Every structure is written in structure tokens, then in C-alpha cells.
Amino acid sequence: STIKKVAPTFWWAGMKNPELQILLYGDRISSADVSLSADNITLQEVVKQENPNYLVLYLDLSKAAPQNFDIILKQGKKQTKIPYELKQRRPNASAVEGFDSSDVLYLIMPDRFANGNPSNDIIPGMLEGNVDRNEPFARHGGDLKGIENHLDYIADLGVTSIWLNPIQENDMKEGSYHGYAITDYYQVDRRFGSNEEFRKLTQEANAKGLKVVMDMIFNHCGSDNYLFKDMPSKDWFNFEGNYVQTSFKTATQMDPYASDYEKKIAIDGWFTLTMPDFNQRNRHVATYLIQSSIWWIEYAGINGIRQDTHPYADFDMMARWCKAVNEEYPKFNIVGETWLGNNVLISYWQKDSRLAYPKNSNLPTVMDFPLMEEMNKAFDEETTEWNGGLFRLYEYLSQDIVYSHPMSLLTFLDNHDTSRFYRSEADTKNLDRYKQALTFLLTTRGIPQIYYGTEILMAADKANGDGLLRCDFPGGWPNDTKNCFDAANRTPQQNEAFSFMQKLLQWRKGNEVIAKGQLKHFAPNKGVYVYERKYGDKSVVVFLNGNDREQTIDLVPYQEILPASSAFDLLTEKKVELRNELTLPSREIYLLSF
Amino acid sequence: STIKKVAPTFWWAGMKNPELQILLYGDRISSADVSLSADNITLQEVVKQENPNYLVLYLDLSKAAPQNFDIILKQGKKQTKIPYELKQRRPNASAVEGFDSSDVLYLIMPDRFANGNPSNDIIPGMLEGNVDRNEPFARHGGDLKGIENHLDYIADLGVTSIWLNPIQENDMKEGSYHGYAITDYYQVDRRFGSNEEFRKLTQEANAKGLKVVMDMIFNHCGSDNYLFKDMPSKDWFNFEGNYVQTSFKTATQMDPYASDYEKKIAIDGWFTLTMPDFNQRNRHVATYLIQSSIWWIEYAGINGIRQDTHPYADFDMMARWCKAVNEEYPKFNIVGETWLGNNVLISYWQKDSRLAYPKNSNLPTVMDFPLMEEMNKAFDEETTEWNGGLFRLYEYLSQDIVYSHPMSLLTFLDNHDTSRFYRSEADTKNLDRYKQALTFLLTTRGIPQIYYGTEILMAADKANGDGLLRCDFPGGWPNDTKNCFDAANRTPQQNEAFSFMQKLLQWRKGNEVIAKGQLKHFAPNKGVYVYERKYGDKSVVVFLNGNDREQTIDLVPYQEILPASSAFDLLTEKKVELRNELTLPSREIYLLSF
Ligand SMILES: [Ca+2]
Ligand SMILES: [Ca+2]
Ligand SMILES: [Ca+2]
Ligand SMILES: [Ca+2]
């Protein structure tokens, strides 16, 4: 009809926040006389703006039960009836579990994991009408069905959650594959699936014991989003809708020496030309985006959101967002991308930050990029008597007083924006670093994330561009020669790697010591880093030898974490003797239980 | 007589704390019956310990006026009268000025600055009976008279304070030159001068407008200190008087993951065999040391103490110490050596630390070693569009939210424990780095310290040992060929360096903008770092070009700190045009006033 788009698509009765903003987009609709035909719904307000193609409606749902109702636009002789549903909430929707340190997240770029339906690789009408598996920056045809097809593999690997790069539609001319330029916040990308397919994926994942986390982006949308292409008003995007390039200097939010000029350039600046910057200080923009997040939580049953670009957005509005989400879903977890150089500035973004006080982001989980930088060097260097190697871990962790909630820090070796743990295929010839890094990651504090393909030694270097950071999982396509979803088609080394991660993950799942236990560590001792996780009377103890050589060490230092004269290494299932001294082969790892 | 040592030597009437501990050392004195012959002084308590050579007396002075009085030991037939003075306080002793960001401190190692009295280079009876100017680790003969002789030079350089490495006596066999193994807390080292000489030095310094800061060490004394050689009890030193070597891991005080074993080894461990670790948890040790600090403040009129090794000592006792000092001298400033790798752990030691809360060190000033590390690389590297060079300064300073009192951070390029700013004589051929580093140091936030000899390009590298970090000031000895205290005997380059520092220092002195002003800075712009200090309506603006090349930059970013279309560079006294763009020669520095 005259109505092109209605947002949200639908809503629910009995949400904690009883307000509903319905955004209407169509042909010169703004002059219309608006009414409702409904049962116990109040139309509070109709908002008109420069662009006559939009109306913004504010409804009060406090007294309203599930129902179908009509929005009615009368313009002279013409009358349009827009039907609208208030669905009935699942029981206990509010009580959906979040994710936490008991979990391990498996990060998947949908377009690059598995093609389970080739018929949707190209969608008539969409601006990017091409797939080309040999172009790193083109669509390759991955989809939701593909992920659904391989849930068995993911669960068997031992992770507890899938985390998806953005699945919301990116109808862009170029670069649509990655998902970070959304053109519709209320639709899965038609090349990945329908909305229903995503709900089904989540159901299927939950039934195999897997949580689902979803990437969302409030800082910016794609330039082909109707909201941008046909702006309601200049106030919806920063710099009044004109492209000004961001500096990426997000330290300006908290830097005590920041300039006014630089704060504006950073936080109001656009990431690129085709990713215009939302003005989150606009009440309509903010509610639109907030509602979008809540919609996907109610509709799809997700356990988590990662808000990319969190520091590039208005601080106050993102605090309101986190508050509004947690008011509706008290156990839900949100992680923000805090890509900064140091723990000090990252800690500011975490909920209850001592350094932000009295400001509070309300953001439960932030990302430990500094730990990533250290872990990418700590297993390759010599650990001397004074410095290097595993000292990086000792020294970094001892600074955890900065962080308000250290067990709500996402930890990771890499992700879709970094070099992979192994930079090149050639580097994967030695798995020592892999084994130490993952032992550390999966036993120390925080919430681990594994990037898809880590478990089969996929390699990549940032210097060759972002496209090759996100190569196709070998096996995800019908015509792939080697299908690495099955052990039978994997190199010996790939199976060594896969089996190692799986051992740790399968052991970690359900393990209350790692999930909730105190942490206690010791300075590297003749190159050997030792630490303990301890919950009640159960404990775990890790030894990591930080050198390419045999080392004997005195065990007297560790008396307070060694309650018995021997224990079993979980990895080799062999006994380790704990009496006075211990000799550790080159790059040894012991993971003891007590 | 039978009394070898009395501590303190004397005291004052009308101190805020009315308690006085008098420690008596002699031949089997502990059985004695003790009394006083005095006017309105109460002997509260006499403390006996394992060693019979000691008595500890506690007196109450609350009702007591200045007087001479006697302590009386009666043992059978023998009776010893120990005379003791309660001096009368100078008026306004309490109100002695501290030091602060309006100051610049000039750090001097006394044995290596100037020999103004060669007759005291060797002192009969002292265990180290040798001087040898050609041995880096031997005494060279510097003294107080030498510093007094060159106060004119120091004041003319433009600094506001002298800071001395320890002047308390180090009667040790080897290594006595540096001062960090004290054998008498109540005596200046006889090779430097008498107590009176130090008081005179201070008087002389004050009259030329210079403050005096004194190094003290509570963590440890020298193994030839009577307190150690002939211990009152095993409880006076950690590990019951037995040598156990410290790990140097002082992060154990605040590390949330610290072990019990490691905390003890670090904080109770000895620095070396000949530097035994005081047990500051012993009430007698603590009062002894506290009183010693207060004594030198009353007696000598000093403005500041640097407590070396502050983190190796008991946290609670050092907080009590800072409180007790500030209760007596409210404006006095104490700086603690916080030699740690990062701002997080350093910030814990600063008074009102948000990360230590609810603990509080009460330590006003801490040392910004991380800024030093950055400054030793920031002026040598390329400053690209994204990273390197002057970015190190931008990035470090933006983390100042960690610090409770950023203007009470001691900043410095080097000191007696580091490589000098210039590692070798050859490196001093280029002064660009010197000029940028010192411009930065003397205009940015904090309390600058210059190490003696920096102003004449003395060079040294840590790798050649500590002795060559502390070479003789050329001119401090009667037989030196080139006397660099006078411009006439200096290389052209030495005079370029000296004149540059002097210009900045002389301009900084009295300058309220630098002392008290806000700081505002900008990300390096095509390699050029720019910042402003601003107090009321007066401001200062620095431009530092962070590359070995000419660069034109847009000035539009800086509109908010450029209130006029031109200004005068303080350094070259030439006009700089502030209109739309600015072209900066290789390594340019502009220091503008408005
Ligand atoms: Ca497909
Ligand atoms: Ca923004
Ligand atoms: Ca002398
Ligand atoms: Ca100690």
C-alpha cells in the first residue's frame, strides 16, 4: 500500500517498559490523521519531522493484553489500515539465562562458516548480486542453515555458546558479507535466512545445550538503510547527515585532557562514508535502536549481545540501553567492544568502574584486548629470571585491581578483526604455543571466546587484509575437497589441535572451579608460571614451562596450593609427583586436580 | 661512659605528638633502674628485650617546656647520668613549605658532585678507608661543603630545589659511597660533613631561594648499623634476623592473585645481605624510624623527603608515617619510590587511590617511572599517523584517570638508578631529543626532577654498572681539567644544552600557568603533538613536531586553544603565525604564551 516499512514488525504485551514506539515509513504520510482501533491501548503522541515520509507513534501498553489491532491513517478521502500484533509472551521470557565465566563462546562469521542452502546465495533485487568464493571481500554464500547443519560439531567441540557476527540485513553494493552495515534492523539478511530460520537455529542450538549471542551495532548503519537514504531528519545522524570521518580516538570520552574539537570528531565522526553515524542523543533514534535489541531477545531467545563500536557511541544513551535491557532480562549479559590499548581506559567502560565513578556504563562485560596482545607474545618469548614470555601474563593479571568485575572480561586469542593466533599456515607446524595459550585461556579468569577455525589451525595475517581473516571453513561448502567437520578428513596436526581444545573445553564445561573459583598465581620460577583456581575445597593447578628447555624447580613456594604429594595431569592422564622438586620438559603443561 | 649511643640525640618541646621514645645503647644496661630528673616529664614505660645492651624509654612531654634534664640509671653501686635536651622550636616550624608542581628538583649524589673539603675524604676509624676517583664503586670524596660552594650555580640553572641522595652515615666496608646502607640514622656521614654543616647548607640554600629534599630509607639499614650488628631482638628485622633474599616482586602488596609465600618473600625479604630488612611491624622499630624523619625536619628545615623502597615496607606503618609527618608539618611533601611497570600499581600507592580504597597510603607524591620509560623512546621514534613517537605521550597521559593526584607525580628523564637520558657521549651529538624531552617535561603535568649533570650532557648506560651512572661532576674537584660549573670551560654543545634548560627553568619558576593550570592536549597531527596549559585567562601552548622532517598541519583543530592570530616562541623569541596552517621544520618546538 502507501506503507513501505513498519518498525518494530510487531511487539508484545506485558513488557516491563510499557511504552512502544512504532515508526511508520511511506509516501507523504506525515500529514495523516492517526487513530487506533484497539483494546486498552493509548496513542500518546504522533511526531512529525522534516521528512514527510515518516510518522513516529508513541503508544502506552500498560493496560493492554495480547491482541490484534489496527493503526488508521486518514488523509482526505484515502484511509489506510495498518494491522499490528501484540503477541503473548512465552512464560519466563524475562528469566532467560545470560552467559558468564562458566561459558565459552564460539565466534562465527555466518557468510564464511557453512553454505547449507545455495539457493539463497544470490537474492533477486539485492544490490550485491554476486558470490565469488575466490574474492576475499565478496560474499561466499554462508548461511544460517549451514550453522544449523553443524551444531553437532560445535557441541562436540565442547563450547557452550555460539556467537554470530551480525545477521541483520546488509543490503549494500559492496562489503555486505561482514554484516557491519545494517540496512534493516528488523530483518535477517535474506542471503542468510528468514527471521524464522534464526529462531529455529536458536531453538536447535538450545536443545543441544548451546547459548546464542548476537552482534548488534548502534553506532552506525549502512548508507543504504532507509533511515539514512531517506532521513526522517538531519538530527538522526551526526554532523547533520554530512560525512565527517572519525579519528578513531575514543579515549576522548574519558581522557581528562581531551579537547572539545577531538571529542566531537571521534564520537560524532563516521566510521566510513557508507557507515553513517547515528545520533544516539535523538530520543527517536535511541528508542528505535533500544527496541530493536529487545525485539530480538524476546523473539529469538538469545542469551547475549555484543555491542560493537560501544565506545564510539554516546555514553549516556548506552548506559540507558544496558539498564533498559537488564530491567527486562535480569540475567542477560551484554559485552561491549572496548578496543583500547590499556586496562585503564577499558575498565572505565565496565559497570561499577571505580575510575568512571560516579558515572556508570552499566555494561556488565567488556573485552580484554590487552590480554590478547600479551597472549600473542607470551608463549613465543623466552621467560628469563626477570622478564619476558610468561611474565607478561603475571604482570598483566596483577593489575586486575583496575577492573570492577574481572570474571566478566571476555578473553580471546584473536577474532575477526585481528590476525589469527597463527599468522601463517607455516607457523602451525609447532603446536606448543597453541597448547600453552589455550590451557591458559581456558583455566585463568574471564569468559573465553574461540574464533571459528582455531580448532583446525586456520591461519591468517592482518597484513593481507580483513577478507582473509575470515576464510571459508573447509567443509562448509558442498564442493570442498577436504571436509574438516569430520576427523576422517583432517591432517594429523589438525586432529592433534582439535582433540586438545576439545579435551580442555569438555572438561571446563560444568566445572565450578574454573567458572567461580578464586585465582592465585606465582611469579615465573626459572621460567615456569604456576597458578591455582580454587572453589571451596576443590582446586585446579596449572604449570606452564615458559621455555624451550628442561627445567627443575623448587616446589616449596607452592606448598599452599599443593595439598597432596601427587596428582593426575588431565591432558596426558599421567601422574605428576609433587615432592620437593619437579622437572619439566620443554614447554611442559600440567593441569592438576585436587 | 657505659652509654655508647642515645637516640634521638635530642628532642623538642611542643611537638604535636607528645610521646618521645629514647633508645639507650650501652654495656649490660638493661637491668638498670631508670628515673628522670626533669620538670614536668613523665617516664611512662621502660622496655627490656633479649639483648641486655639496650633500654627503650617512653616519655610523655605533653606538659613539658624546653629544658635540660637527666636520665638516671642506677645499677647496684654504679650510677650513670645521661643529660638530654628538649630544645625550643623555631616559631612556625610546623608551617615549613613542602614542594609541589611549582618546583623543579635537582637530584645530587653527594659523593660525586663536588669536593669542597678534601680533609674529610678519609676519616680515621671508618671501615672504608679509601678514596679512588678511578674506581666507579669507590668513594670519590664529594661532600656538603662542595654542594654549598656551588649553590650559586644550581640557583642560576633555574631549579627551585636540591634533592640529595642519602647523607646519613654509611660506615660500611664496601659500597658506602651511594648512601643506601645507613649505619647511623642520627648522623650525617662524617665524610660528607657534620650535622651542623647540613643545617648550614639548608640555610644557605633557602637564602638563595632553593628548597631541600632528603632521601631516607626505612625498609633497610646497613649490616654495620649498631641496631643490626647488636640487635635489640630478633623481632627488629624480618626473617628473625636471618638473611632471606627478596624477590623484588612488590606487586604482591596489591595483586588480587598474590600468594602468601610470595608476599612474605617480597616484603619481608632482604634487598641484599648487607641491607637487612627492618620489621616495621615492631612498635619500637617504627617509632625509632618515624622519629628519625621528624628529627631531620625540625633540625634541618628540609621541605621534603623521598622514601626509597617505599613498596618494600609494611603498608600500614608507612601510612601511619605519612599521617604522623603531615600532622606535624601540614604543607610538607613526601614522595615514595614507586618503581613498578605500570600506572595501575603505582596509583595504588598514592594518597586517596581509588583502586586502594578503602585502604589509603596517605603518600602525597609517587614517582612516574612509566612516563620515564615512554619519554626515553618518544623523542627518537617516528610519529606516524596512527602510532609511535609522541603518541606514547598522548596515550600515556590519557590514562591519568587512574591517578588520584596527577599534579603530585614526580616526573623525570632519568635518575641515579637508570641509564642517563643520553646513554653514551656519542649520542649527545644531537640535541633535538634533549630539547623536545625537556620542553615536554617542564611544561606538562607533574613535578619535574633533573638529575645532576643532565644540563651538561653527562652520559651513561645502565649496562656498564651503577658506578658510572654517578660520575663526578667535571669541576667539582680541585684538580679537574675542565670546570663545567663555568660557561668558559664548557664545550659549545654543553653550553647549548645548559642554556636551553636554563631558559625553560628560569621561565617556569614563578609561572602559575605551569604550576597550577589545567592541561589539554591533542592527538599527534601528521606527527605533531600539541597541548595547552591554562590558568584563568593566561595560557601556554606547546607544539612538538615528532618527526625528522618539515610538516604543514591544519590549525583548525586547535581553535579552542589559539585565542590570537600570532604569538611569540619563548625559546627563539621569534613570532609564530597562527592562521589556518602552520609549517614546522624538522623537530620544531614552539612554546607560545597568551
Ligand atoms: Ca547459502
Ligand atoms: Ca558515533
Ligand atoms: Ca671531601
Ligand atoms: Ca621490607
mmCIF file of N, CA, C and O and ligand atoms in Angstrom, chain A residues 219 238 267-269 277-278 280 312-313, ligand 2:
data_model
loop_
_atom_site.group_PDB
_atom_site.id
_atom_site.type_symbol
_atom_site.label_atom_id
_atom_site.label_comp_id
_atom_site.label_asym_id
_atom_site.label_seq_id
_atom_site.Cartn_x
_atom_site.Cartn_y
_atom_site.Cartn_z
ATOM 1 N N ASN A 219 26.121 2.280 16.769
ATOM 2 C CA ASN A 219 26.933 3.438 16.400
ATOM 3 C C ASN A 219 26.573 3.885 14.987
ATOM 4 O O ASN A 219 26.479 5.078 14.711
ATOM 5 N N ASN A 238 24.832 12.189 12.900
ATOM 6 C CA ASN A 238 25.724 13.222 13.401
ATOM 7 C C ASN A 238 26.313 13.976 12.222
ATOM 8 O O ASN A 238 26.340 13.474 11.097
ATOM 9 N N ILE A 267 33.467 10.950 18.368
ATOM 10 C CA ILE A 267 32.273 10.247 18.846
ATOM 11 C C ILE A 267 31.109 10.565 17.911
ATOM 12 O O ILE A 267 30.238 9.713 17.722
ATOM 13 N N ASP A 268 31.143 11.747 17.273
ATOM 14 C CA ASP A 268 30.172 12.102 16.251
ATOM 15 C C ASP A 268 30.687 11.798 14.846
ATOM 16 O O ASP A 268 29.931 11.919 13.892
ATOM 17 N N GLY A 269 31.958 11.411 14.688
ATOM 18 C CA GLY A 269 32.516 11.154 13.354
ATOM 19 C C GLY A 269 32.070 9.796 12.802
ATOM 20 O O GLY A 269 31.824 8.855 13.565
ATOM 21 N N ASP A 277 26.888 7.841 11.034
ATOM 22 C CA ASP A 277 26.921 7.764 12.481
ATOM 23 C C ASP A 277 25.561 8.179 13.022
ATOM 24 O O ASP A 277 25.139 9.306 12.823
ATOM 25 N N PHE A 278 24.880 7.252 13.698
ATOM 26 C CA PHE A 278 23.620 7.576 14.353
ATOM 27 C C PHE A 278 23.886 8.634 15.430
ATOM 28 O O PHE A 278 24.913 8.602 16.120
ATOM 29 N N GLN A 280 22.729 9.159 18.743
ATOM 30 C CA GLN A 280 22.004 8.488 19.805
ATOM 31 C C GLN A 280 21.432 9.497 20.804
ATOM 32 O O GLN A 280 20.663 9.135 21.663
ATOM 33 N N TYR A 312 32.299 4.338 20.559
ATOM 34 C CA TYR A 312 32.075 5.377 19.552
ATOM 35 C C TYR A 312 30.683 5.983 19.701
ATOM 36 O O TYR A 312 30.361 6.953 19.021
ATOM 37 N N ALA A 313 29.899 5.456 20.639
ATOM 38 C CA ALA A 313 28.535 5.937 20.837
ATOM 39 C C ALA A 313 28.419 6.805 22.099
ATOM 40 O O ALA A 313 29.281 6.760 22.987
HETATM 41 CA CA CA C 2 29.246 7.713 16.978
#
